[PDB]
Design a binder for these strands. Structure first.
Lengths: 421, 185, 172
RNA sequence: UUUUUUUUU
């Protein structure tokens, strides 16, 4: 904080900020208060009635959500497995090495209350059709998330192939007309079930029923596409994390970095609840989203774009961010890393480590400095004013000379608009 | 009781009289040859309207009662009198009725039509049945008549027998009217 | 259980039709189904049927019939105080309000309309009254039970000495 | 309503 006093009167005031946005939450705060992830379902009806209800509702296309939830509960309950290690996360524990667990042993079950809708029942539904029905429903959930006809049909054809390779003579349900199951994403229990299934079948990938994971892979990194970008930039650059966090040169991505790196919220633990913070309900607005970290996302993906990266020409271009300042830092860093290759001795035979024999030099001119360090680059940048070098712009242009596909309001579009000039 | 722990009491007491008011609309058609002698054959033929039931569960008692009502008061078409080659029987009804039953609790209904169509072959008789029904609960405060009252009974005799012809077990409470017991099926 | 329930009763019966009735059996058949679609008080339903019997016993002609034979028409009216032994258990409380029904009757040979205006209500008085069963004019013969059954009313003619109402399934 | 590679058994 800082004090700002009215000059003419010497009065004291404290300028606050408007809040059109919403506050931020962390997963650690959910397990610091209550320790049980609730899940509400119905278990009044037997399995055959739910099978009939689901199958007929899907054939007609007027199935209810509660019946699908209860059917998935009553189907994914006899699946189990072994357990290797000591699963635990955010002060919770699950089993111990050398026992068996189910799929719903990760969340607490309870009793849903209130009146329930009706269905269209059938009295001929062979059991063999359970192998692929949960898979079909999860695939429907997956395909109902992207609003694009081409992608939608490609994904539903992949889904039909997935069902065919298991139970061929399977036929499509939910016909191509009135669209259903796109409202289900607004529900909370369905996404909890999907997330639990995805985590369980992600840890045990050798399970014979692993094909269900075809339908739940979009649910893991949801609303967290700022960590992915940071990792991709760390891999493309090839440097350690310390050098990457050093090269920021502006306190707008740094605010996001401080917002994204707190003691709790354990990252790098694949067997944790972190990636599923959204679906499980642990947080409303995830701090790693791209709507609260726009500068970080844009700078990271522009640096990635300027270093001959593949996953750079399909990102989006968030607005309300000053492109002139982040762009310059990204360009400087890209030129710095892609214009000096660090060579040196790495493993030394006994007492024979090569030493750099460079004390006499002639690099007093505008030519670049060798090695990669912000200290010596800021000096050269300052001594050569803020104007980018013509060689730097030539490198940037040749780095983006050829680009086939582009989409409106994409970082590729912005780069081809400003740098291709 | 033959085992241990297999529920106890069922305190909620499903076994008790509950009343349900609702609008009903019915339309039935039957086609066959060798025109249709006697009423027992009516029950026998119509009993195969739900050999493979695909209707909205929870309405089976209502649908069975409704089929019985429609079979009760079906009127033969003039063609039956004029020509015997291909007789036809038609029926149509509509109103508001309230039924007592103890099957359980019925979920919320909806004003949707349901169509059924099946062939039959009972010994000498063969043909087709085609029904179209629509039932939906009413929340008004009118004083509707009992569904049983809608049966005139001046044709055919006894209600336990007839209720059994359709697969429906009922009771003959002395001081009131007939109340459902269960669906034999 | 033999329960004696007291009530004041008023009844007005009217029948209109063509093909004027000849035998009492046809009239009884026509009147027995006066309640095709009953929407009255449930707990008074059996009692009304008993009162219909009374109206049958009191069938009368009017000068209208003597004025023309092509509009057959019969009237009847009765009223008073009575009490009835019954084995239906317990009857709910009853109010004093009029009730009316009008239905079409179609038995083939005879077709027309039947109108019944009834008002049965509690008798809070403590004075003795005769038997309601010993109120009709059908001293006639022992076939009172046959008439009741033809209407559809089950009665007992055992050593009790009366024609007490027995049961329902009056529908047949 | 969230989202922001017409990526993904």
């Amino acid at each position: 904080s800082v004090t700002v006093k009215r000059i003419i009167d010497n009065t004291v005031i404290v300028p606050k900020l408007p809040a059109n946005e919403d506050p931020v939450e962390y997963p650690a705060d959910y397990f610091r208060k209550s320790k049980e992830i609730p899940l509400y379902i119905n278990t009044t009806k037997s399995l055959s009635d739910l099978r009939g209800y689901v199958y007929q509702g899907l054939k007609s296309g007027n199935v209810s959500i509660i019946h699908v939830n209860s059917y998935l509960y009553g189907a994914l309950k006899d699946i189990r497995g072994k357990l290797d290690k000591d699963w635990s996360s955010f002060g919770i524990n699950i089993g111990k090495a050398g026992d068996t667990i189910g799929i719903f042993d990760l969340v607490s079950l309870k009793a849903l209350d209130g009146v329930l809708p009706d269905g269209v029942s059938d009295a001929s539904r062979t059991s063999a059709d359970d192998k692929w029905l949960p898979l079909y429903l999860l695939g429907l959930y997956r395909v109902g998330r992207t609003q694009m006809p081409e992608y939608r049909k490609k994904l539903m054809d992949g889904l039909t192939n997935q069902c065919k390779m298991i139970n061929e003579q399977f036929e499509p349900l939910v016909p191509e007309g009135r669209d259903i199951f796109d409202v289900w994403g607004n529900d909370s229990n369905y996404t909890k079930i999907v997330a639990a299934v995805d985590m369980f079948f992600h840890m045990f990938k050798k399970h014979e029923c692993a094909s269900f994971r075809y339908g739940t892979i979009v649910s893991r990194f949801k609303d967290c596409a700022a960590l992915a970008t940071f990792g991709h930039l760390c891999k493309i650059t090839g440097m350690s994390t310390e050098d990457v966090t050093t090269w920021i040169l502006n306190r707008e991505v740094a605010d996001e970095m401080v917002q994204m790196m707190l003691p709790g919220q354990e990252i790098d633990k694949a067997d944790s609840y972190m990636p599923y913070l959204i679906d499980f309900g642990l947080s409303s607005k995830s701090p790693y989203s791209s709507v609260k970290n726009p500068a970080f996302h844009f700078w990271g993906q522009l640096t990635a774009l300027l270093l001959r990266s593949t996953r750079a020409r399909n990102a989006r271009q968030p607005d309300d961010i000053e492109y002139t300042s982040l762009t310059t830092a990204g360009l400087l860093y890209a030129y710095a890393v892609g214009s000096s290759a660090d060579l040196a001795q790495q493993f030394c035979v006994g007492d024979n480590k090569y030493t750099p024999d460079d004390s006499t030099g002639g690099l007093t001119t505008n030519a670049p400095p060798q090695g990669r360090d912000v200290v010596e680059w800021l000096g050269w940048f300052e001594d050569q004013n803020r104007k980018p070098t013509p060689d730097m712009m030539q490198y940037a242009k040749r780095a983006v000379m050829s680009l086939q596909g582009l989409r409106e309001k994409t970082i590729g579009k912005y780069a081809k608009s400003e740098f291709d000039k | 009781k033959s085992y241990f722990g297999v529920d106890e009491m069922d305190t909620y007491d499903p076994n008790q009289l509950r009343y349900e008011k609702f609008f009903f609309t019915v339309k039935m058609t039957v086609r066959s040859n060798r025109p249709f002698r006697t009423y027992s054959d009516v029950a026998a033929a119509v009993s195969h309207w739900d050999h493979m039931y695909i209707g909205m569960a929870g309405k089976r008692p209502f649908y069975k009662i409704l089929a019985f009502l429609g079979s009760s008061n079906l009127k033969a078409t003039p063609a039956v009198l004029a020509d015997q080659g291909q007789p036809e029987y038609h029926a149509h009804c509509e109103g508001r009725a309230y039924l007592p039953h103890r099957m359980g609790k019925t979920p919320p209904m909806l004003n949707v039509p349901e169509h059924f169509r099946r062939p039959f072959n009972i010994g000498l008789y063969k043909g087709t049945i085609e029904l179209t029904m629509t039932i939906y609960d009413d929340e008004s405060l009118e004083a509707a008549p009992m569904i049983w009252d809608h049966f005139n009974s001046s044709k055919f005799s006894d209600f336990r027998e007839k209720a059994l012809m359709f697969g429906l077990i009922v009771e003959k409470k002395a001081s009131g009217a007939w109340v459902l017991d269960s669906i034999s099926h």
